[PDB]
Symmetry: C3
Subunit: 279 residues, 3 copies
Amino acid sequence: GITARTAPAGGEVRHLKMYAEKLADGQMGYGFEKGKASVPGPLIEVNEGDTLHIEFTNTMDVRASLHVHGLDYEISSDGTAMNKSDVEPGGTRTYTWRTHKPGRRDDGTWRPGSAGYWHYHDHVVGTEHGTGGIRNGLYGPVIVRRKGDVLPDATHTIVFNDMTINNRKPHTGPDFEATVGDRVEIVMITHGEYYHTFHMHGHRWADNRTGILTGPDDPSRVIDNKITGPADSFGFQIIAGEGVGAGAWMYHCHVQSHSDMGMVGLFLVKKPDGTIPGY
Amino acid sequence: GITARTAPAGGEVRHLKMYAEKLADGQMGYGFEKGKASVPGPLIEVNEGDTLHIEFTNTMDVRASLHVHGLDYEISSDGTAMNKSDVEPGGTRTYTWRTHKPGRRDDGTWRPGSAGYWHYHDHVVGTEHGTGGIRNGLYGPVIVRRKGDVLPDATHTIVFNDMTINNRKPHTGPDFEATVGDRVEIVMITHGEYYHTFHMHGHRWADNRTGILTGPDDPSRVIDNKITGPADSFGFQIIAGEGVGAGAWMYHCHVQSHSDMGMVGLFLVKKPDGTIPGY
Amino acid sequence: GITARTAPAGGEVRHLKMYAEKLADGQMGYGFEKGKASVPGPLIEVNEGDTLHIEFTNTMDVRASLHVHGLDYEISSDGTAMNKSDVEPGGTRTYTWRTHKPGRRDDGTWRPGSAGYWHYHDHVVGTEHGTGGIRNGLYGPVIVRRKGDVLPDATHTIVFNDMTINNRKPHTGPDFEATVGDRVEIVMITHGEYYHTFHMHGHRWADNRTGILTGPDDPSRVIDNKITGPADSFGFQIIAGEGVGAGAWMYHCHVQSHSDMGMVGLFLVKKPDGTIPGY
Ligand SMILES: [Cu+2]
Ligand SMILES: [Cu+2]
Ligand SMILES: [Cu+2]
Ligand SMILES: [Cu+2]
Ligand SMILES: [Cu+2]
Ligand SMILES: [Cu+2]
Ligand SMILES: [Ru+3]
Ligand SMILES: [Ru+3]
Ligand SMILES: [Ru+3]
């Protein structure tokens, strides 16, 4: 990324409120505001070095928590019953997530770095691994950017949760929309019981941390199809319609009975005039 | 690759005919000529930069199509019913696949590049995701070479399609044959309903784009066993019998009930005299 | 690794005895000594270049073998019935495993190198793919170090074998223990019928050969969750409690019904005083 927008150095303390709430249809969701919970829950995005203090309130009548992948947390923020890190009905707790930049340890080794595509979810609704909470919709994405990472025009979250996408009914999407040439970021998370294969028509990405290649030397596989299982997370950027043009470009699980039974959506890539050939 | 044969720069327009045909036993296959359809379908191999105009004829009495992974195609060549890209019984359509080399975009980012191990398959027989067509044998491999890629002595295609290899009956192979020291390329594709693990005895490869390491700096895992799911594709080269000698070297799915029920074949690596110790 | 301990150049001939034995409870295990078989079997660790002559005795009343992944072996040491490489009841056979360093071939290509996280298992108990032997506990880890690889304080082996960890009953661990700051190596192997997702709380690693990054240029995904299938093997090192502190840090399969039914253990990271907050 030279003149594309790139992430700055991180290092700020940030604060945020989150709620877990039962929804009217029986699902459960997270939100930054009461009455505005979503499934998936809202995107949290930070830079390496940032600390995030989340003031979490459980508005439900059963215990619930927040567990995160990837980021640094102490045991008091693991979100488990075992470590007394869950939240009673109506209660509030502050969870802290930290992130760090990569760098050389004293022994001359290289410490990895927090950056990546991650996710948060419940760990105590229905079972002590959060099986009911996850099923009901308590999951959401987290992005940690490294300094210099390329930033997108927009970010969409796609979760394969059992045999649904984002807890939707079969064959109801979601659909996402872009214009030819937009830089679109996809955060792809899987939950539940089953393995899946995520496929996008007309587009492809690098099987590495960022989903993009910095230059000619990266030997990573370039793919359009990727096996995933429960609690896996990856992400990538694509240039919408790059080399292929506008169209109603399908994305789906490529396990045949899964696509047949509704794990399908559309990436609607428009011309400037807003039209889509064949749609 | 210094003095091994390496792929040249691409950039040619190529033309080819393909047919979909029902076979006498009830399967369905692609071929470059009528009466010579195979399962898997024939290998298509191009260099990055090439364009391929495929003049496709559906000789079957049901609609059928050709969808490809990885390569650049416009929406009119996606092979779906939705985009009116399938082919009626007896009909002909020209599908176009393009490929591009990697390079620097105007924004200073690096555009990936088409090269890889890919595949084509039907998208409309039995269901609108091609479940019946895929089951019946409408799939085949595609290789896109980058300039400088090492070329093999021979290429073999292994497809895990449900609980078959290449739609064969249990325990009937296929078997492949080589001589110690041959450079053998394997294209490995999975289709259907199930996950698998591809394993080869006596040999190993790099989990990256080419399946080979260019030099000492590539940190990719070297493996002999790899989980795959529907529509996954990867490929590699091995030197037959390198460091291990001649033998009837098994390859199989390593999921235990799958190997037990017949997802097994042999890589028959011969001495110059044509014999195989233990066989 | 500058001043962390690093593996030396390999090249030695080594000798070792192994036994396969039935255990009192009906399982089957390997050991370096009679009466001391374990499940998983003992760790074998060598440097690239080493040769290992294993003098194997089958003390059981059914045929058994030793098959290895990754390492160089001739067909006479593949461990299969087909190649007459298994061992009758009460019998002895010498299996030979070799390893090689990476280097430039005559054609200018780069030959991979044996180094990695590998495993050995039976290939003839119950079926000719060793399904019964594997089920009963005939599996163990193998590590091949490359010169310069970072060495750990300790190595733990975690095997997802069907719906068990290391053939243990549900919810019985195993648990591993460390002190904050220890360099812990994990060898993670999967066997059987099912796919899994390996997850560790509070820790993460690089999805590459060593599980660690040498420096800022490696683009490998940093993860805490990884899909695996039968006969897959990977490994990594983590600094216990790095950035997160002491705690009873869970590891588990993240497939929800699997964790619910007992594929869970604890990574007990202690302060110097031996205590664990929340435990
Ligand atoms: Cu699926
Ligand atoms: Cu999780
Ligand atoms: Cu299989
Ligand atoms: Cu496909
Ligand atoms: Cu599992
Ligand atoms: Cu094996
Ligand atoms: Ru958990
Ligand atoms: Ru499709
Ligand atoms: Ru085998």
